[PDB]
Design a protein around this ligand. Structure first.
Ligand SMILES: Nc1ccc([As](=O)(O)O)cc1
Ligand SMILES: Nc1ccc([As](=O)(O)O)cc1
Ligand SMILES: Nc1ccc([As](=O)(O)O)cc1
Ligand code: NA
Length: 129
């Protein structure tokens, strides 16, 4: 599924990401835009052999099991394919675990480089939430 901007903002809010760990909703919408282009089916291989999955490009080295990242943890206890669903529940639950992990949203390279410190409220302008 390719989400619309306000459509994703509504979904993330309904799942309690807004202000989760102090990160306002625009942070999560911005991250999703620059990690996946709002596409739940997005996958991208990393140099280390792991792969990033879904709307928030969750990594198989630590978070989900993709059957091919030898030496990996599956801390969200989920197959990585579950993170590609049109239903973002699994991605959201796993993201809440990641953002609690210690480095907060810095875990997401696109957020750090393209969202952090910017006017992220712009990402939810016009939405009815
Ligand atoms: N903004 C953005 C554009 C393209 C992609 As991709 O799913 O092609 O790696 C991901 C994010
Ligand atoms: N050889 C081997 C291949 C894949 C995995 As796994 O990414 O499912 O944990 C573990 C070991
Ligand atoms: N200056 C400023 C910085 C961030 C935010 As907000 O995205 O946490 O609502 C609001 C104002
Ligand atoms: Na894994």
């Amino acid at each position: 599924k390719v989400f619309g901007r306000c459509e994703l903002a509504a979904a993330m809010k309904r799942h309690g990401l807004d202000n989760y760990r102090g990160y306002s909703l625009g942070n999560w919408v911005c991250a999703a835009k620059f990690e996946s282009n709002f596409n739940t089916q997005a996958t991208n291989r990393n140099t280390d052999g792991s792969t990033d999955y879904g709307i928030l490009q969750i990594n198989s080295r630590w978070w989900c099991n993709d059957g091919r990242t030898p030496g990996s943890r599956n801390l969200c206890n989920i197959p990585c394919s579950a993170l590609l669903s049109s239903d973002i529940t699994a991605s959201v639950n796993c993201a809440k675990k990641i953002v609690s992990d210690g480095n907060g949203m810095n875990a997401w390279v696109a957020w750090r480089n393209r969202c952090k410190g910017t006017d992220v409220q712009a990402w939810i302008r016009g939405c009815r939430l």
